[PDB]
């Protein structure tokens, strides 16, 4: 139940995702929005940044969790 | 022996420096965008 | 909805004073903690009690790795 | 003293559920936070907004230390 | 992977079914980063009971080395 | 302020301080109790542990701050080594 | 006190501060010049860099302390981002 | 002002040799150190004596956190 | 032997004041630095000038590892 | 070890005898920990001139990868 | 390939965790003795 | 030209070294006493501690360098 923010660039990238691929990323975003910190997807090298990784397609979402505003901040979408 | 490692771990015993400087690319696009963030709150309906 | 909180007088003072300095309202502060707790199922503070339980497990491993 | 907090209905539900699982009363949780804030002068959450503000400060330092152009000055010049 | 027990750990074990069920999963692909006992080289932990087993994975000998079992 | 806990060993050590030395340790303790994290007195090598140092006498108090209970947990009081 | 160096870019930024804002940055600078390492203002991610922060205005000064020359080297002055 | 330092003959030799290689005068070196000490209130050397004093403090903390025995107290009890 | 040092008056004050606090004499302090310099062939201070030269070499490597 | 050059590094090289003399020593046992460019994965540096060559050692391909040559 | 590594590096590609917990033994005897140090200045002649 | 301190235990260990082995350790100690910090012999895990390693015999000396007193502090000798 974290809020969801998208960077504009991240949102623009999102707009030009295949209907299929964003459907599956979205299914993992909503899992993320409730308990956003998945230790396995920690993007080492940046504060509180995590990946969402797709088995097929190989597309990647990167978000940062900001606890002080309870937001998940989607920064990047692509490959 | 080395085969027994690659069997279970599903990778090479050497350090994956290729993924090191692939995750560095991502960090870059992320470090760069964190410089000029443009946040937008979205209904999941609005996705 | 609404929540009614019983608070020590001195703590109301010091905590509100501090919140103004930070430019965060008391209501925003408390709604953050409740949302956090609701989603993470834990308090937002460092888990140092669990942290130094692990540190003692390590101290036992260390001693045992001396003479396997 | 006393505090009245205006709270969203669903958030009251979800947070109370969570607090009971933990066996912490809503008052105890909020009194911890207020005490923390009072003594430490910050929110108990990771200071990641401040963290990635510094990250950009570091980025300006890095860029400028490539070709540093120091100028020795006194306060009276400033 | 091979499975080794320290003498002390084996004494603990004797005094188990559910842990053993998790050990065979550990024996094939032993490195579970989420249970990383941070602060120690290559060491990991293994719902109920609240009992804790600690083992070390040694790549050069393909063994899982159970060092401690208890609380 | 934060609550104050003393370990049993730490309290025993506290008891056999000269009236003067515990007097000055106490005075810095009340300051710690309202802002327990002095990053300068950070005791590196253990989670959230900090020192209280007395210029004269050379006595050392070590406490760990447990934020989740807002307590300062005094673990050791003394002067180790020569 | 430590010597004071300004980068050329930093000095240009300094010039176009309101008389008030540079006035308060300056007053904290003279304090820094006699004890430049405030570990609390440590800018993590670069060697020996520290911040000077103004409560109001939100302006940030960044300096690096070069002990081998006893200088404080002010690298950046401004307010990055929104 | 002025300072007079009593110095071992061989150390004067060896340190002067070293200072010349660096192109630093004995006075500049000593004025850096005195300025550092004045502002930072410590010697510029690694604080390793203090470092391994803390290391033993850490060792006592570790031993005691094995079986912690907290006692809640007030200042008036102390 | 003996060394004669020219020193600013204010710096003599502040540095001696500080040395008493530390319980180190000015002579001991200066003989340490000279012995250190003699043996290590460098000043005892952090080599931050050399340090942030390396940091810039790394910044160039980083940029180049982006597109090899 | 194999020897790879980045395109930019090779342009630098063209504009050398003493460095090459040190490269062949680098090509057999490439990891010299003393010249570790700390702050970077697997990167190292190579008296006179004050010129600097930087290379990365990649264990999985046995190459020494010269990235930069200059000052 | 793995042979080409061991040829030059003179070790195994896996991480030497055996030397890890051999250098830990030494650190222990050192950590322990640093607790009760008993320093003695010595002429090299006095050795 | 650093001063040399031995821990008493380190000195006792030293006393019962073979005449041959201490002769070669000593030859490396005097190299250490002038420029004590050898980056390769850094004993990782402890402040400013270094090894002296012998090809033959396999005996080990461990010392810590204390710049603030310009001493090399010999802590351990053995295998």
Which among E27, J4, G64, J65 is positioned nearest to D65, based on CA atoms? G64
Partnered with residue D73 across adjacent β-strands are G4
Residue to substitute from I58, I61, I66, interface B, most B β-carbons within 10 A: I66
d(CA C37, CA D16): 9
Q: Which residues is G62 bridged to in the sheet?
A: G51, G76
CA E62 to centroid of chain Cα atoms: 14
| Distance, CA of D5 to CA of D26 (rounded, Å) | 11
The token pair at A68 is: 């002080």
Long-range CB contacts for residues E54-59, cutoff 8 Å, separation at least 24: E54/C57, E54/C61, E55/E26, E55/E30, E56/C61, E56/C65, E56/K17, E57/E1, E57/E30, E57/E31, E58/K17, E58/K18, E59/B5, E59/B13, E59/K14, E59/K15, E59/K17
Distances (CA, A) of B19 to A64, B25, E14, G27, J41: 20, 10, 43, 48, 11
CB F28 within 8 A of CB F21: no
> What is the distance in angstroms between the Cα of E29 and the nearest Cα belonging to chain B?
4
Resolution in A: 2.8
Nearest CA in chain K to J62: K5
The verdict on E24 touching A (C-beta cutoff 8 Å) is no
- Residue listed under structure tokens 């991610």: G45
Q: Could you tell me the end-to-end alpha-carbon distance of chain H, in angstroms, rounded to an integer? A: 49
Cα I25 to Cα H8, H34, I3, distances in angstroms? 16, 12, 16
d(CA F58, CA G58): 41
List helix spans (H) across C6-47.
9-22, 26-40
Q: Give the residue extent of every domain in chain L.
A: 1-79
**In this structure, what token pair is assigned to residue D60?**
């300006």
- Closest alpha carbon to I36 in H44, H24, J34: H44
**Is J36 a known active-site residue?**
no
Single out the residue of E61, E25, E62 nearest to residue E53, CA to CA. E25
CATH number attached to the domain at A1-79: 3.30.2310.20
Does E33 lie at the interface with A, CB-CB under 8 angstroms?
A: yes
Q: Which helix H or strand E contains F5, and what residues bound it?
A: strand F3-7
Q: Which fold has domain J1-71?
A: YaeB-like fold (3.30.2310)
Chain-chain contact of I46 with G46 (C-beta, under 8 angstroms):
no
Q: Residue B5 and residue E30: Cα distance in Å, rounded?
A: 10
Any idea which residue has 């500049």 for tokens? H28
Give the total residue count for chain D.
78
Q: How many C-beta atoms lie closer than 10 Å to residue H35's C-beta?
A: 19
Q: Which fold has domain C1-68?
A: Arc Repressor Mutant (1.10.1220)
DSSP string, H23-78: T--HHHHHHHHHHHHHHHSS-SS--HHHHHHHHHHHHHHHHHHHS--EEEE-GGG-
Asked if H65's CB is within 8 angstroms of C55's CB, the reply is yes
Are H58 and F49 within 8 A, CB to CB?
Answer: yes
Q: At what angle do helices D26-40 and D9-22 cross, to 10 degrees?
A: 90
The architecture in CATH of the region F1-82 reads 2-Layer Sandwich (3.30)
Query: Which CATH architecture fits D1-78?
Result: Orthogonal Bundle (1.10)
Strands (E), chain K: 39-41
Distant-in-sequence, close-in-space partners of D48: CB < 8 Å, separation ≥ 6: A47, A48, A64, A65, A66, A67, A68
Contact K/E (≥3 CB pairs under 8 Å): yes
Q: Give the DSSP letter string of E57-69.
A: EEGGGTEEEEEEE
Q: After which residues is chain G broken (C to N over 2.5 A)?
A: none
Tell me D45's DSSP state: S
The helix (H) or strand (E) run that includes residue A63 is strand A60-66
Interface test with G, best of F40, F41, F44 (most G CBs within 10 A): F40
DSSP 3-state assignment of G69?
Answer: helix
Alpha carbons A49 and A38: distance in angstroms, whole number:
10
Structure determination technique employed: X-ray
3-state secondary structure F10-25: HHHHHHCCCHHHHHHH
Helix (H) or strand (E) holding L6, with range, is strand L3-7
> Residue K28's CB: how many other CB atoms inside 10 A?
15
Judging by beta carbons within 10 Å of its beta carbon (0-12, 13-18, 19+), is residue F58 exposed, middle or buried? exposed
Q: What CATH fold (topology level) applies to the domain B1-47?
A: 6.10.250
Query: What burial class does residue E50 get, using C-beta atoms within 10 Å of its C-beta: 0-12 exposed, 13-18 middle, 19+ buried?
Result: exposed
């Amino acid at each position: 139940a974290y809020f969801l923010d998208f960077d504009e660039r991240a949102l623009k990238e999102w707009r030009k995702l295949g209907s299929t691929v964003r459907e599956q990323l979205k299914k993992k975003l909503v899992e993320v929005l409730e308990s956003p910190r998945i230790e396995a997807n920690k993007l080492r090298g940046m504060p509180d940044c995590y990946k969402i990784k797709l088995r097929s397609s190989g597309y990647r979402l990167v978000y940062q969790v900001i606890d002080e505003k309870v937001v998940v901040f989607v920064i990047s979408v692509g490959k | 022996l080395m085969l027994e490692y690659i069997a279970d771990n599903e990778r090479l015993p050497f350090k994956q420096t290729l993924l090191s400087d692939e995750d560095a690319e991502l960090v870059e696009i992320v470090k760069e965008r964190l410089r000029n963030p443009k946040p937008v709150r979205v209904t999941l309906d609005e996705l």
